[PDB]
Amino acid sequence: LTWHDVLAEEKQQPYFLNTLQTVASERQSGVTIYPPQKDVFNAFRFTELGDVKVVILGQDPYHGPGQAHGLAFSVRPGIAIPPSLLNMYKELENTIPGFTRPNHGYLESWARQGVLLLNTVLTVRAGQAHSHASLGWETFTDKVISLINQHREGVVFLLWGSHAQKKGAIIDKQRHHVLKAPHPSPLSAHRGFFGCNHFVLANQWLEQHGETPIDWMPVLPAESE
């Protein structure tokens, strides 16, 4: 089963298609929407349903130019690393042996290892956090989490912040592995994100069940001649 297999019906529902209509309208009404339409579903492009190993929930896409490109917490090459991602990198440096501060914030290489970087809201108006929160995206990502819970086995969920925690509140804690911490945002990171030991902990779960660990040092696409 692929994502389209299990979401094809869901994507024919009016809530979902009305959501896309609204986005498509706002893009043509003098408002910039992030990320670009071709990137909205990049988390699904880069880690297929059967490849999901670790799910990390974000909430809103980043709302500045060059930041959002369809992966929770990630930014494009050449963009400054946002404070939430810098705090994640700090926890990584304090816990993953050999890890050092990346010089970029691009996390595609996580996604390609089975890390589903899923924002619960998949678009946003430029400069206006949460501006599409009351469209249909939360409904859609509810269904996505529900399908991973049902169709997959042994997934680690990293739930950061009250919003993400609620969002995954009914995941099967037997068949899957749920880890909670406050959010890596500067407003909450010292309240429990630091010391959470989620990157190591996820890897040990994976290893325990015979799966390979995530290489958490993210890498940029290379150059060709």
DSSP letters spanning 196-219: --HHHHHHHHHHHTTPPPP--S--
Q: Which two tokens stand for residue 24?
A: 């498509």
Report the C-alpha gap between 124 and 159 in whole angstroms.
21
Query: Which residues have a Cβ under 8 Å from the Cβ of 132 and sit 6 or more positions away?
Result: 22, 23, 33, 121, 122, 123, 124, 125
**Residue 33: strand pairing partners:** 125
- Catalytically active residues, by annotation: 60
Q: Scanning the structure block, which residue is given the tokens 């206006």?
A: 128
Please give the sequence-ordered ranges of beta strands (E in DSSP) within 60-193, or none if there are none: 115-119, 124-125, 156-160, 177-181
Q: CA-CA-CA-CA torsion for 219, 101, 43, 30, nearest 10 degrees?
A: -110
Q: Scanning the structure block, which residue is given the tokens 């959470």?
A: 196
Q: Which two tokens stand for residue 97?
A: 């042996």
Report the C-alpha gap between 123 and 37 in whole angstroms.
9
Rg of the chain (C-alpha set): 17
Burial of 78 (0-12, 13-18, 19+ CB in 10 A): exposed
Query: Which residues have a Cβ under 8 Å from the Cβ of 20 and sit 6 or more positions away?
Result: none
**Residue 56: strand pairing partners:** 117, 158
The strand pair at 33-34 and 115-119 is best described as unpaired
Find out whether 58 and 110 touch, Cβ atoms under 8 Å. Answer: no
Determination technique for this entry: X-ray
Q: Which two tokens stand for residue 187?
A: 């407003």
Domains in the chain, CATH or no CATH each = 1-225 (3.40.470.10)
Rounded to 5 degrees, φ, ψ at 125 are -75, 140
